[PDB]
Amino acid sequence: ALLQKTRIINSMLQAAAGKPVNFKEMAETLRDVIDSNIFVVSRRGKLLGYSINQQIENDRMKKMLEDRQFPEEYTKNLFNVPETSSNLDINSEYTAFPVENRDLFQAGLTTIVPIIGGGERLGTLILSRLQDQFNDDDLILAEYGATVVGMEILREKAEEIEEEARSKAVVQMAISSLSYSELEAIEHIFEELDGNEGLLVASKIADRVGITRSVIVNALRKLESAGVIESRSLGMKGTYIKVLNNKFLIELENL
Amino acid sequence: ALLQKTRIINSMLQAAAGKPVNFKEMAETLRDVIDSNIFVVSRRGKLLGYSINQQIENDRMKKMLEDRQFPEEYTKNLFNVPETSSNLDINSEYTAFPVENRDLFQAGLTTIVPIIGGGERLGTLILSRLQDQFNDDDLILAEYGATVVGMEILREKAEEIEEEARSKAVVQMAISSLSYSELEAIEHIFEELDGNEGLLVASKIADRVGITRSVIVNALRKLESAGVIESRSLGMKGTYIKVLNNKFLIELENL
């Protein structure tokens, strides 16, 4: 019953809007829609999700469902596949696969669609039934489905790193905003500290370090200012901090 | 064969990848694989791109094709469509459209798809033949179709501002690294200046402003460093400069 079938696939997509990416509850969707087996493997060939409904004969797939890694020779060509291969097992004649890719498709009549977003193969969609041949409708669905879980990892991954170089801009911001002293204080602080959690009253360092309180006491708050650290001191008599940004200590040690 | 017609689409989708989003050249690729009229209009109702073959009886649409600005009464109810209107003109019986959108659909047995990604109705997609019914799959194409133009405005507008908020980003930079002095200078400079184009001679400012050539002449380079302005000084005897970022000048005035 076509169109609905998809409109349904679409229904699902619209819906992932805010909610962060989630393959499985989306693999399901394809399973449901296409009534097929569904496994999504990334470029690196880690399964990000899959789903099923009845047991199978495929011995050489589970290996990965236990270490997330699939070895540097197997999934390897699984990737070399230039296009969709339509209907597939262990008894059809073709010289499109080399004799080093024998057992990967294995059990349940398997079909294959490459996931292919922003100009790049981001991975593969395995589908694999047992009996019912893979219909022209049935394909069209996957191709949408792939195309969908296409610009999704895309999405997910941008998300994933656009908030790396957030953190990372942040930190060379604040650090960009200290005096030779202030930062030197900060420096000497965490050289003589451990982790985000830190307590040793500023008072102490000053005399040792030979930077006034006043300042040390301040470099400090400059970080309260672009978030990076937290303390809300307890009337001197001890001074404690914890950090709000992992990429920091890192950077700071990068000095 | 519909699938072909679909995969054909796919192929054009991969091959936008690098190339900067082109609507027409996809409006066509629709009007190809669908065999109909394609018109992509937006949230605000601008016709981004379109694509036809024969001559048409819609009068009330040749309006936007010169001002790009559709009425605050037409496109809007065009916006109001909760979902895909399958076939249309002006003889049928329906209590959807409000008594204020009679002639927008005018020519071509018209059909309607809303474009929705980033969990947002990005705009509307308009197909319109003359006789042939829009079939099931005619839809099926059309929709996915949208869905692409879909996450294309996404990519374009995404692209639009990750680079408006670049300018801004770099100018808040450059400036931010200006000593009060230096800043004082660039200031005094452009206040007695007109547009991105300037020839006024450093020597003469210092005095008139109370600052060393030393520093004027420093603060200038600084912005060429961060490229914001161009000058290749001449051997004094007249300095001439140019601004290479619009956002900049704006920002100055906002200090």
Author numbering:
A (entry chain A), B (entry chain B): 2 to 256
Study text:
In low G + C Gram-positive bacteria, CodY is a global regulatory protein that controls the transcription of numerous genes. CodY from B. subtilis and most other low G + C Gram-positive bacteria is a DNA-binding protein that is activated by the branched-chain amino acids (BCAAs),2 leucine, isoleucine and valine, which may be viewed as signals of the metabolic status of the cell, and GTP, which may signal the energetic status of the cell. CodY from B. subtilis consists of 259 amino acid residues. The structures of full-length CodY from B. subtilis determined here reveal the effector binding domain and the DNA binding domain as discrete entities separated by a helical linker.
We have solved the structure of unliganded CodY in three different crystal forms containing 14 (form A), 10 (form B), and 2 (form C) molecules in the asymmetric unit from data sets extending to 4.6, 3.0, and 3.7 Å spacing, respectively. Examination of the molecular packing in the crystals of unliganded CodY reveals that the basic building block of all three crystals is a tetramer. The tetramer in the form C crystals and one of the tetramers in both the form A and the form B crystals are generated by crystallographic 2-fold symmetry. Superposition of the eight tetramers from the three crystal forms suggests that they are essentially identical within the limits of the data. In the crystals, four CodY protomers are assembled into an unusual tetramer in which four wHTH domains are sandwiched between two GAF domain dimers. For the unliganded form in particular, the tetramer is compact with extensive subunit interfaces. From within this tetramer structure, there is no possibility that the wHTH domains of CodY could bind to DNA in a conventional manner, because the GAF domains of partner subunits in the tetramer occupy a substantial volume that would be taken up by the DNA duplex.
